[PDB]
Amino acid sequence: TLTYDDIVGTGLANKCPTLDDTARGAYPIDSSQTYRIARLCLQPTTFLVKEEPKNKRQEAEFVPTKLVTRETTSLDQIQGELKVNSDGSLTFVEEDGIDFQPVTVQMAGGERIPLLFTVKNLVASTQPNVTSITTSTDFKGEFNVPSYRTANFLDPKGRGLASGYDSAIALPQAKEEELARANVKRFSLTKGQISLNVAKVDGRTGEIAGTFESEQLSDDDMGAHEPHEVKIQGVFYASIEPA
Amino acid sequence: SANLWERFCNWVTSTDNRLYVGWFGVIMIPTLLAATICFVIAFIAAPPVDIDGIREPVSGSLLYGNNIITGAVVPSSNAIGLHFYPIWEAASLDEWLYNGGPYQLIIFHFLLGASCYMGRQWELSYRLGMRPWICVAYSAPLASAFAVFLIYPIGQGSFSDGMPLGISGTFNFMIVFQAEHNILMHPFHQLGVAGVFGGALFCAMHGSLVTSSLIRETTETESANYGYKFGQEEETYNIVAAHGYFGRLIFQYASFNNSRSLHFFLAAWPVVGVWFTALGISTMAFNLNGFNFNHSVIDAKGNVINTWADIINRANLGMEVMHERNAHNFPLDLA
Amino acid sequence: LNPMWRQGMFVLPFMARLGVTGSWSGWSITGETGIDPGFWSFEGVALAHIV
Amino acid sequence: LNPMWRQGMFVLPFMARLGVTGSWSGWSITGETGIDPGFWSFEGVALAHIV
Amino acid sequence: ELVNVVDEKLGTAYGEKIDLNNTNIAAFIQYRGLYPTLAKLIVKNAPYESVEDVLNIPGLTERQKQILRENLEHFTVTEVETALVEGGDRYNNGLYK
Amino acid sequence: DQKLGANVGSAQGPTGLGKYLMRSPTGEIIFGGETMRFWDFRGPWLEPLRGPNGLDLNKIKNDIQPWQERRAAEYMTHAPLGSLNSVGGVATEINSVNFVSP
Amino acid sequence: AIFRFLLFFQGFHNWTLNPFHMMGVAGVLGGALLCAIHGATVENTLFQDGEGASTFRAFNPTQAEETYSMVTANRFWSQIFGIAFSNKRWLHFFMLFVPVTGLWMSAIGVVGLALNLRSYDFISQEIRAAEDPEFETFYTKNLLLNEGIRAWMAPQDQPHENFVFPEEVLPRGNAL
Amino acid sequence: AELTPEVLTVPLNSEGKTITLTEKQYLEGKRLFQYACASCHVGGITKTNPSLDLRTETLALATPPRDNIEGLVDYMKNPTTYDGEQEIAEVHPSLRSADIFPKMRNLTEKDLVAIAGHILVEPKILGDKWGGGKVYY
Amino acid sequence: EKLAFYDYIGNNPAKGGLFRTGPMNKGDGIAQAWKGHAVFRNKEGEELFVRRMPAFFESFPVILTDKNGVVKADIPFRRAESKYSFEQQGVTVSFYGGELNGQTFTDPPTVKSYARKAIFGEIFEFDTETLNSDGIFRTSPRGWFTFAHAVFA
Amino acid sequence: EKLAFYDYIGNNPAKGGLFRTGPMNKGDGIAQAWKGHAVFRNKEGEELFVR
Ligand code: CLA
Ligand code: CLA
Ligand code: CLA
Ligand SMILES: CC(C)=CCC/C(C)=C/CC/C(C)=C/CC/C(C)=C/CC/C(C)=C/CC/C(C)=C/CC/C(C)=C/CC/C(C)=C/CC/C(C)=C/CC1=CC(=O)C(C)=C(C)C1=O
Ligand SMILES: CCCCCCCCCCCCCCCC(=O)OC[C@H](CO[C@H]1O[C@H](CS(=O)(=O)O)[C@@H](O)[C@H](O)[C@H]1O)OC(=O)CCCCCCCCCCCCCCC
Ligand SMILES: CC1=C(/C=C/C(C)=C/C=C/C(C)=C/C=C/C=C(C)/C=C/C=C(C)/C=C/C2=C(C)CCCC2(C)C)C(C)(C)CCC1
Ligand SMILES: [Cl-]
């Protein structure tokens, strides 16, 4: 174990715990004993942004991006119950934790793509009949993607949703129909997909690890413009305990 | 070769160079060149910077929609605070430009060189056999740069609160400063304007007086300036006629007759005044602000009778309440 | 559908003809990404000449 | 609703203050028609000064 | 068409009474004995399909349910608005003195 | 706010950064707001809440001691802010508290 | 009462953004520079006309030779700054010109403020700021400060208007 | 325009009975209000919890009622939440916690009545200012 | 119409800027018609009045008061605790004479829109297309002459 | 698409004018997509061809 000072500034704090190459066993499920996740953690590795195919529909792919912010990406302290289902499957239901981190990445052109990387209200599920959690025991489910900026946020001209100006006060006698979209703030709420596929188990202490892949929309700037589609790959670590 | 290093030192120290590269110059010249080059490029083509660390990038470069008056080089991020953020501290240049990297590179290089610039103003004076203290006069504008770019950020806990490198950005620095510190109601600032106003006053005083008491050596249709040759023995103006005039303007004993006592006063006044204004910013960097006469005079019942000090407070609230919109989450501004 | 010669580029093609086909910002003439042009990017070339 | 002082007219009013309120083309400052300004119209005044 | 959900919300029951499903917790202070304990319970316990549903909060003592019944006339209920509920704005919407 | 029933860990501020808790540039969990600049602060009252990765969400949730709460309240209401004529607070404050931090 | 006059001009007229004012300060600040730099140059380029260290007494009130080395001052600044005077008559007229010209420019600007013909905005900036909610410069920032100044000051600064601004209409940022 | 005893007449208890303070008590309370309250309660607000102020109306809708001498005085000995369903003397200055809040050690029953009186008289004088914050400054 | 046109702040020489070049029409646009006098009322039927903009102010808030000057309605900045929002007060607007004569509007956006305009005095219909106006006030020849000659003098 | 784009006279250098300044995009506009090959037929079903 390492104290705070042994981590400060090293970047280690933005790193989900890891299991050794050994720990590749299996954790048993009593199915008559409630389980929960004491600590789920998500560490991003890559941020992919699906590019707009221009007007010419030609099918679009995801493109790598540079992390214009720094080591503030990881999700940690996630918690909730891992209820066993009648079909013998497992479903995780998140309660609370650092379930979101605002990320901003740049592209080829130089465009900054801000997103709210999150897993809020996560409902991941596994395969039916899973007496023991083996290596690669896929977790799949949805989560909620709230607006990047919240209600109180004001644009450089003072306009906002829950507060701020009603219109473009700098242009007292201008036509407003054109400025409509920029004056009227909208609060976006969308769904997201994620899949946690195990790679390392440890029946002894009951801590699994592996890799994840999630998809969601980026910031729409209070509904000022269209959001980009984002794909996020990284690694995860979960602490399963009876409780 | 009499000895390479010995020659090198003789070349550096040489008073026969068009521009005196001193020993301070060996540090000045490179640091200033890095500062200037980085600035020019930044001011023109640098991308928007997240100054307040709230993921709200501010564009201040020409190519990104600015003009000379609005354009600026934006201070480093508030997420960085007082941390050292060189290029080799970033995963990429994209990241470095987003977090206001250039700003630190400029201010550190400028302040270092500008200090050496002061050091050189001593050195050349030494090599030429003239008295020093010219550099001491330059210590006042330098101390202001130090206070605005370094001292205030150290005090406030972040370089993001340092004065931006641009016209309008400077205006922002002032307005906000006034809100958080009430600088207009601070003695050190008042001494500053006194030095600056007086400075301009005296600059015009002396200027006019001297140029008005010039000895005639020029034609009616010939520039009065030609009545002076570079490298004269005697004076080109009648200082006794000047004193005679100004002495009657106010009253004799309130007038200078000693050129040396005159020029000392001419140098002392603005330098001392600016010294205090530099100390003002350095003092209000630790939140020892100007006088607070809010709700001082109250009537016999307890009603608050307003003064001009209260009207100033209303303007100050307006600045405070509106500055850094989305940066605050809590009631008191302790940062 | 929108290459250099459609955008009235005159110097840009001469830089690509001899190798320089990338930018410090990430994009490239061939249309690739993730590429590392090194120093000798269009920016790099432009920089050198100015110096 | 659209008089001279809305159209950034600076010289025109000074010509109207002293009598000249018509044009050779038929219209007039007051908004009348069929009027005959004679020679001294805005054109006329402009003409004179040039000469 | 584009509309400001918050300004539109002010034309309903919200903006007239304490909305048990939207209105921020601090609003419960303008009535006797509602704020600390009870308002926490109200907000924490999900939205409500009707005003009276608040009486069904599990654990409520006989006195609490008494207080609630008294202040029901000051309550209403509207659709949960994300803009007003997201970001934990019901516990702190960034407003102070 | 946590006593009012707020989940400090997942609370989203106006900019979408984290009303109460956020991350430092190197990943450590720190306090939110303009206070992101002072994440280098260490103090007796605050340390027992800190973990190996910074502020622990578990200790914050139920290990907060009363003496820390009133300690925080004390130091909050005694920030080194004041005027030359010794009037504690922001330049816009009203006369009442005669104080300027030593 | 003069301090409010400054803050008023900022809030309502955006006086700092006025080119004529800018020339003004350029004249005063630069004039306060010439005052300083010239005073210091002379005192530290003086000839030795006495045997004491306090060289003030060693001055001849009755003209004759130059009390300070004009030739040395020239070579000094020519090597540290690159540019230097070499004509006291021009040097002193310049000390008249700069601050007097400055005050005069600042005057013209105020004359325009009488008709409220201020240098408040940049139209190209506002137009983009309206259409694009992500566009922000230090210029836009400043205007928001003006709005706060105007709103919070007007009631007690212009009593004759009987202003009544409800709390809800007062422009405010977050928390503050 | 003066501090009349007409102004210094504030409600003593819940049953309508009133008490009339003296200019000596007022000043003394005012001084005692700066000594131990102003730190957090400057100008009738609450820095560490802006949701609750010292407005007479706010104190009236408190539980128990704290808009009178008896109310406030009880609060300064055994402080509660706005609903009174919880004692907060551990994180709030009071007589029963003077060991924790040294400022409260000196304070005697005479001091408590003065401070209480101060809170009830100020809004009579200042009005909206006493309640609101920077808006009314 | 002419008489009504003078009661519009967009003709006040004290509005405008030093570098806001061109005629007054490059601003609010070419005046086409008088929309008519706007009378504002609330649910109770009370007639409200829009506080006009002083020349000093580049921007001004929308506030409605009765005859006695009592604030009855406004357009809030912070909605969280708004007491006088047009929605809460059921503010409506009616026009008499002119383009909008005899018509009534009750949908809050439209009402606030005209309330936002009443600030400037009589509401007019402008042609912004033609001269490509930017909607920013400019001063009259009266202003420019005064400025030039005050400086020259 | 790229191949089809070359078979468009708006990329022929022999089109244009001496004072028709700017890029080719100021002319026909920025190419967005290929609408597709157009086949012309008449009532009899015969396929026609555009000169
Ligand atoms: C870098 C900072 C800076 C600087 C250097 C300046 C510089 C200037 N400002 Mg300024 N200003 C600034 C920032 C700055 N501004 C900011 C941030 C604001 C806020 C927006 C303003 C707002 C502002 C306003 C509102 C005005 C100025 C004006 C001026 C100019 C005139 C000052 C002067 O000489 O008064 C001298 C004034 C006189 C009247 C001279 C005559 C005085 C007599 C001769 C003295 C008699 C004294 C008597 C004998 C003694 C008795 C007194 C008794 C107490 C003993 C000057 C060019 C003024 C201007 O432009 O005027 C044209 C003006 O009105 N400023
Ligand atoms: C000869 C070399 C050359 C060539 C082939 C090009 C080619 C091009 N340039 Mg270019 N350019 C060049 C040099 C060149 N440039 C130089 C040296 C500069 C620096 C000033 C520029 C600056 C520049 C800019 C700023 C732009 C271009 C653009 C363009 C593109 C549009 C073409 C255009 O507008 O033509 C226009 C051609 C003409 C108008 C022909 C003018 C012929 C004159 C009028 C004849 C004069 C006759 C003379 C007066 C007679 C007197 C003699 C008598 C007394 C005997 C095209 C790819 C544009 C672009 O990027 O497109 C997107 C653009 O915006 N260029
Ligand atoms: C002073 C006399 C005067 C006045 C009051 C006007 C008034 C007007 N003119 Mg006009 N004009 C004049 C003389 C005048 N004119 C002259 C002499 C010419 C011939 C060049 C014109 C040519 C002209 C045209 C072509 C047009 C107008 C228009 C207009 C109208 C729009 C106003 C405008 O654009 O202002 C703009 C004002 C400014 C931008 C202010 C400039 C101030 C400068 C920048 C200060 C310079 C400071 C200096 C450099 C400092 C250095 C000194 C330092 C070294 C010490 C307005 C009614 C327009 C119109 O008809 O409206 C529909 C129009 O299109 N004018
Ligand atoms: C990439 C890009 C675009 C970068 C942009 C960066 C940026 C934002 C730049 C903006 C700059 C900008 C536009 C500035 C605007 C401000 C400005 C130009 C104002 C207008 C000026 C004006 C007409 C106003 C009127 C007032 C006026 C006349 C003031 C003039 C001020 C002035 C020039 C003072 C000179 C001061 C100075 C340093 C003099 C040095 C003289 C000298 C070396 C003396 C030393 C000396 C002393 C002695 O005693 C003796 C004996 C000798 C011998 C001797 O030598
Ligand atoms: C990372 C490390 C980078 C290393 C860089 C490579 C080495 C430096 C190469 C320099 C090449 C450029 C030559 C410049 C010539 C010159 O300056 O004057 C030529 C003169 C003539 O002397 C000189 O010239 C003489 C030869 S001759 O007369 O020129 O032929 C010579 O004999 C004598 O020794 C010499 O003094 O040089 C000097 O007077 C010495 C001072 C030079 C000052 C350097 C610039 C000062 C900058 C200060 C900061 C400014 C900030 C930005 C301003 C916009
Ligand atoms: C005197 C002397 C000398 C010389 C020296 C020199 C001359 C130096 C120089 C130096 C230099 C000359 C330096 C420079 C530097 C530069 C820099 C440092 C820059 C930087 C920049 C940057 C970093 C940029 C960035 C960016 C931006 C900002 C935006 C756009 C993009 C980019 C990225 C580009 C010798 C040695 C002989 C000896 C001693 C003495
Ligand atoms: Cl700001």
Curated annotation (Swiss-Prot), chains C, D:
Domain of life: Bacteria
Segments in the Lumenal topological domain: 1-43
Compartments where found: Cellular thylakoid membrane
Subunit (UniProt): PSII is composed of 1 copy each of membrane proteins PsbA, PsbB, PsbC, PsbD, PsbE, PsbF, PsbH, PsbI, PsbJ, PsbK, PsbL, PsbM, PsbT, PsbX, PsbY, PsbZ, Psb30/Ycf12, peripheral proteins PsbO, CyanoQ (PsbQ), PsbU, PsbV and a large number of cofactors. It forms dimeric complexes. Part of a photosystem II (PSII) assembly intermediate complex PSII-I; crystallized from a strain deleted of psbJ, it forms monomeric PSII before addition of the oxygen evolving complex. PSII-I includes 3 assembly factors not found in mature PSII (Psb27, Psb28 and Psb34).
Function of the molecule: One of the components of the core complex of photosystem II (PSII). It binds chlorophyll and helps catalyze the primary light-induced photochemical processes of PSII. PSII is a light-driven water:plastoquinone oxidoreductase, using light energy to abstract electrons from H(2)O, generating O(2) and a proton gradient subsequently used for ATP formation.
Family (UniProt): Belongs to the PsbB/PsbC family. PsbB subfamily.
Protein name, entry field: Photosystem II CP47 reaction center protein
Entire protein: shown range: 52 to 102 of 510
Swiss-Prot record, chain E:
Protein's UniProt keywords contain Signal: yes
Localization: Cellular thylakoid membrane
UniProt-listed GO biological process terms: photosynthesis; photosystem II stabilization
Main location: membrane
Cofactor comment text: PSII binds multiple chlorophylls, carotenoids and specific lipids.
Keyword entries, A-Z: Electron transport, Membrane, Photosynthesis, Photosystem II, Signal, Thylakoid, Transport
Gene Ontology CC: one annotated term: photosystem II oxygen evolving complex
Membrane topology: Peripheral membrane protein
Role according to the record: One of the extrinsic, lumenal subunits of photosystem II (PSII). PSII is a light-driven water plastoquinone oxidoreductase, using light energy to abstract electrons from H(2)O, generating a proton gradient subsequently used for ATP formation. The extrinsic proteins stabilize the structure of photosystem II oxygen-evolving complex (OEC), the ion environment of oxygen evolution and protect the OEC against heat-induced inactivation.
Oligomer and partners: PSII is composed of 1 copy each of membrane proteins PsbA, PsbB, PsbC, PsbD, PsbE, PsbF, PsbH, PsbI, PsbJ, PsbK, PsbL, PsbM, PsbT, PsbX, PsbY, PsbZ, Psb30/Ycf12, peripheral proteins PsbO, CyanoQ (PsbQ), PsbU, PsbV and a large number of cofactors. It forms dimeric complexes.
The family this protein is said to belong to: Belongs to the PsbU family.
Protein name: Photosystem II extrinsic protein U
Species the sequence originates in: Thermosynechococcus vestitus (strain NIES-2133 / IAM M-273 / BP-1)
Portion of the full sequence shown: 38 to 134 of 134
UniProtKB/Swiss-Prot annotation, chain H:
Keyword Transmembrane helix: no
Cofactor note: Binds 1 heme c group covalently per subunit. PSII binds multiple chlorophylls, carotenoids and specific lipids.
Positions that bind heme c: H41, H92
Keywords: Electron transport, Heme, Iron, Membrane, Metal-binding, Photosynthesis, Photosystem II, Signal, Thylakoid, Transport
GO terms under cellular component: photosystem II; plasma membrane-derived thylakoid membrane
TM regions (residue ranges): none
GO molecular function, one term: iron ion binding
Cofactor(s) of this protein: heme c
GO terms, biological process: photosynthesis, light reaction; respiratory electron transport chain
Disruption phenotype: Cells do not grow photoautotrophically under low CO(2) concentrations.
Localization per record: Cellular thylakoid membrane
Family membership noted in the UniProt record: Belongs to the cytochrome c family. PsbV subfamily.
SUBUNIT field: PSII is composed of 1 copy each of membrane proteins PsbA, PsbB, PsbC, PsbD, PsbE, PsbF, PsbH, PsbI, PsbJ, PsbK, PsbL, PsbM, PsbT, PsbX, PsbY, PsbZ, Psb30/Ycf12, peripheral proteins PsbO, CyanoQ (PsbQ), PsbU, PsbV and a large number of cofactors. It forms dimeric complexes.
The protein, known as: Photosystem II extrinsic protein V
Organism: Thermosynechococcus vestitus (strain NIES-2133 / IAM M-273 / BP-1)
Swiss-Prot record, chain J:
Protein's cellular compartments: Cellular thylakoid membrane
Organism domain of life: Bacteria
Identification of the protein by name: Photosystem II CP47 reaction center protein
Full protein stretch here: 307 to 357 of 510
Function noted in UniProt: One of the components of the core complex of photosystem II (PSII). It binds chlorophyll and helps catalyze the primary light-induced photochemical processes of PSII. PSII is a light-driven water:plastoquinone oxidoreductase, using light energy to abstract electrons from H(2)O, generating O(2) and a proton gradient subsequently used for ATP formation.
SS bond partners: none
Subunit note: PSII is composed of 1 copy each of membrane proteins PsbA, PsbB, PsbC, PsbD, PsbE, PsbF, PsbH, PsbI, PsbJ, PsbK, PsbL, PsbM, PsbT, PsbX, PsbY, PsbZ, Psb30/Ycf12, peripheral proteins PsbO, CyanoQ (PsbQ), PsbU, PsbV and a large number of cofactors. It forms dimeric complexes. Part of a photosystem II (PSII) assembly intermediate complex PSII-I; crystallized from a strain deleted of psbJ, it forms monomeric PSII before addition of the oxygen evolving complex. PSII-I includes 3 assembly factors not found in mature PSII (Psb27, Psb28 and Psb34).
Upper taxonomic lineage: Bacteria, Bacillati, Cyanobacteriota, Cyanophyceae, Acaryochloridales
Organism listed in the record: Thermosynechococcus vestitus (strain NIES-2133 / IAM M-273 / BP-1)
Similarity remark: Belongs to the PsbB/PsbC family. PsbB subfamily.
